[PDB]
């Protein structure tokens, strides 16, 4: 899934 520091 998406890493902590994504977006």
């Amino acid at each position, epitope marked *: *899934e*998406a*890493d*902590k*520091w*994504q977006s």
Partner: antibody
Amino acid sequence: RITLKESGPPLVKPTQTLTLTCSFSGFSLSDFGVGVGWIRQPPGKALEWLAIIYSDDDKRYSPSLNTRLTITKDTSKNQVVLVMTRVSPVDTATYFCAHRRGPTTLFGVPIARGPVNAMDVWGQGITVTISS
Amino acid sequence: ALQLTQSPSSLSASVGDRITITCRASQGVTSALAWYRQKPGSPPQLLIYDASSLESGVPSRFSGSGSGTEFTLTISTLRPEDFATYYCQQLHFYPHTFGGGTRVDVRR
């Protein structure tokens, strides 16, 4: 200066439980967005990511080892513990813990996330052999 | 899961050469990629973070470029301490994968 060091048993028998401790200095696991992860390296093989834990206490694990791993932190002792259950011979490897930076902040405002993209400081590694 | 393939897996070179190692991801990882150099008997050492930023204290002959699915590390003038194994690591998706490594040894 950030330094980390792994400790635990050098030898462990199959089916047993392995508890590894990462003791560090130079940062606190209460600092903003910081992480501490574990990576292993069987002799002669590639690095393999195992798990990581952040100061806000979010935890993530390798899907292949999820059922056998538990990672936890002890903020006041500056330690991160990784517990692996039911080990078998293929778990023999050198185990490293490592620091992961949190985003850079300016007057306590996150302004740069590029520094989180790497594990920047590593411990020397601890060699663990699994044999009965 | 996500696959990180390094090329070449092994590479021969001499002091003074320019080498470039490449790492390709099966799905885009944006710029969340790091390069490390690991000398025998030692832990990996961070060279480049966030695909192209030079880590503090790391010599300028090391350079990283690329984003998305293709990245490259180039060492412009190989020094003796660079005979080692290099790894790339993706940090966009969990688990945070490592490539298979590329061994750089003395050509003869």
